Design a protein around this nucleic acid. Structure first.
Lengths: 78, 141, 52
RNA sequence: GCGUACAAGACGCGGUCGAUAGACUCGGGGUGUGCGCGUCGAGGUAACGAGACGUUAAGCCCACGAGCACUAACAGACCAA
RNA sequence: CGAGAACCGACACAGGUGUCCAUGGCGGCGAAAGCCAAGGCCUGUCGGGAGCAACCAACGUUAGGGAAUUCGGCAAGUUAGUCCCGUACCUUCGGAAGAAGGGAUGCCUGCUCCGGAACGGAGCAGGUCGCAGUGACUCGGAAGCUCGGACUGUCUAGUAAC
RNA sequence: AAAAUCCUGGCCAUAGUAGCAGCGAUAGUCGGGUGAGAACCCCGACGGCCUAAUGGAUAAGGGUUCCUCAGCACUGCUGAU
RNA sequence: ACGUGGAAGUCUGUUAGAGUUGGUGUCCUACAAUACCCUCUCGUGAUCUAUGUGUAGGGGUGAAAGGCCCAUCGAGUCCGG
RNA sequence: UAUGCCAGCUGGUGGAUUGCUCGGCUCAGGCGCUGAUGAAGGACGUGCCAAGCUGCGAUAAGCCAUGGGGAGC
């Protein structure tokens, strides 16, 4: 069901990746897979919402640790 | 996809190609476009609307403009350029020595200074003897 | 000299098709030729090559 | 899930009978006192004013440690005389 | 189309190829740097993974010493903007010269002077923060002796610029 | 013809190897659309790149490369709707 | 002394544009049959540049290196002998 | 007994070989000039769709007459 969990996203952004290339794309990837293997779903749309939030500044600058809302439904896995 | 629509859209929109919205989620409509009238219809049903043009920063320039251009944020250790190239001579110099010459031509003209003492001041101002008109006047006595 | 480019850059028209000789052949800085005819009113040949 | 290891491979440790990694808090450290406001400040009618002091061992920050199961070490697969 | 794919170069070639927009903002001497509009782009077109070892290309920082390196300080570094002070031998009296060397530089509050005025310039007094005020960027290391050619200029398109 | 660094064609090893990184322009990421198929085709958001130019208008030169529709055997430094 | 002014095959300058010293770096089956990057020289002048136009092979053109005359030069290239 | 060597077999790749000849090569007999009445030659046009070639020429792969030919074009 709905749950709130914090996404940790240093592990990728600034940890690796390109600082002045991605950050933003890295962030989405990480987020996509903590919501997943949590829910146990293949992947979730997750945007827009925390996508402006993720890149609401430059690509390079990234925000560490975004909390989120989560919803899943029983049908095709969401 | 609907690159072509993008062709219109900004056109009868009057914006650049880059700044032309897309829905999204309205890609069925816009998609089936194919007519300039079609694209400007869907424009009406706001699905087709773009904007978000950038604006001048005004941050670096503003407060700085009103500070410098006034005494401040200047000095030695800001100004580049020689002494000239900012506050030039051969410019200021004709700011005075121009006015001055005038007010020793409206005098001895006016008749106030005879013609022996307008002569003297005459080439004694076009020879760095003066400061400002008032200084000129004072020596005039 | 050698293609660099240093050559090929030259964007000048030359050696266009001649009126009567299908080949382009005719220069524009020249008068007419580099294939048969013009200036000579005949055909152009030259034995620089074929044995006669 | 991590390193006492490492170019691939290898190696080593831990996996809820758990402190392996992250978060948070504290300890231990680096800079050198924050924003704001108050007083002072050469002066200037005034506007304005570089800067000084107080608040403030401040503020900001950490690739280390500890506490702590909150989060993630799930789930489960396979090979084998 | 007019070009890091429509042109020439065998190619969707990091090369070559004329003109006008030189008045977009901050910056500053500036058609400079840096940052940002308008406009254009993610096609200088293969991706995924390992703290990602050795080795290589570009590059940053290295204590104490400071050219011991080397044919040679090659390479890199140093200096740097602006104002004030001051400036040797020599000299064709032009120069040498930015010689050298020394000092200053931010911000804030209130002002004076030049000018018709500028969002122009030059100063004054007081207050005040930092290790550092041309805080990035932009930005000369300096001096002497000798040889040659007087100087600016020309040259081996493709190992020689003297 | 066994031979001439012999001529022409075909073919093996080399190798699933080198290159598809290096350039002051390091550029994508998350959702979604279409599709038999999508890392690179399109939409949005976020993040960036270019500022005498990766912007605008043109000369030469090219010559239909322009627009639309349908396509993917060829071409595209991978893939491609 | 102050002003007048502004001359210059004058100076600084990656303004544009031109040139090409060192790195003997990168590349050296290249991006390239002369390239890339940093450095460096000139930048009102005997300057740079587009287009048009003239000079032709024992001939031209040459601030002269035997340099250049379409990747060809101590005698171009093509074909013929 | 992997990696693998030599020979064969089935399939492929390749296009030799054999066979074939709408092309060449050579000899021989005959015949032999065209053009301003534009060959002559060249240019540009001309087709339902037409880029090349050929043919034509704004009457434009053609128009008319006579003869031949013949059920196709």
């Amino acid at each position: 069901d709905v749950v709130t969990r914090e996404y940790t996203i240093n592990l990728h952004k600034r940890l690796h990746g390109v600082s002045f290339k991605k950050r933003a794309p890295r962030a989405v990837k990480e987020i996509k897979k903590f919501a997943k293997l949590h829910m146990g779903t293949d992947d979730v749309r997750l945007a827009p919402e925390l996508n402006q939030a993720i890149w609401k500044r430059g690509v390079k600058g990234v925000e560490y640790r975004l909390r989120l809302r989560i919803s899943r439904k029983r049908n095709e896995e969401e | 996809n609907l690159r072509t629509q993008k062709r219109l859209a900004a056109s009868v929109v009057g914006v650049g190609k880059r700044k032309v919205w897309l829905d999204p989620n309205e890609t069925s409509e816009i998609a089936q476009a194919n007519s300039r009238n079609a694209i400007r219809k869907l424009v009406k049903n706001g699905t087709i609307v773009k904007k978000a043009v950038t604006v001048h920063s005004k941050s670096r320039t503003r407060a700085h403009a009103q500070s410098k251009r006034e005494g401040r944020h200047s000095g030695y250790g800001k100004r580049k350029g020689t002494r000239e190239a900012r506050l030039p001579s051969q410019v200021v110099w004709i700011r005075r020595l121009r006015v001055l010459r005038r007010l020793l031509a409206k005098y001895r003209d006016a008749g106030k200074i005879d013609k022996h003492l307008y002569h003297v001041l005459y080439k004694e101002s076009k020879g760095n003897a003066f400061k400002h008109k008032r200084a000129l006047v004072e020596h005039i006595i | 000299g050698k293609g660099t480019p240093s050559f090929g850059k030259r964007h000048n028209k030359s050696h266009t098709l001649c009126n009567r000789c299908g080949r382009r052949s005719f220069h524009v800085q020249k008068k007419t030729c580099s294939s048969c005819g013009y200036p000579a009113a005949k055909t152009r040949s030259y034995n620089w090559g074929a044995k006669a």
